[PDB]
Amino acid sequence: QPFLKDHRISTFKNWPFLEGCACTPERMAEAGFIHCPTENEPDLAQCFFCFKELEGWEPDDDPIEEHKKHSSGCAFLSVKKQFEELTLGEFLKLDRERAKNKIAKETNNKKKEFEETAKKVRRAIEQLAAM
């Protein structure tokens, strides 16, 4: 479903950078991107495949260029065929890589939230250490 450029392109119905820019909904959706606007970062877009999240876009940001630059190890980036031209096998291996990519982003978020808490814990324990 998200593998379809057209499921993706439909998420940008309120995306700022339109015709005239480089990160147009089309060049974005074609680069694996999906529009995930939060109240504070309304231009936040996320790769449907590697789940990296990029904000603060700029009129001449190349969705593909930014993609390679921040998530170089993304498999979707290396797919050179059109979608319909993927073997069922290729599509399975792609979809399995994706599940692995979702497990990874989640782990990162779990570890990140954990370190944020631990630092706050370590710091309060230092205070005691002094006395």
Binding site: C23, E53, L54, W57, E66, H70
Partner: peptide, 4 residues
Amino acid sequence: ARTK
């Protein structure tokens, strides 16, 4: 763009 930058990392969120």
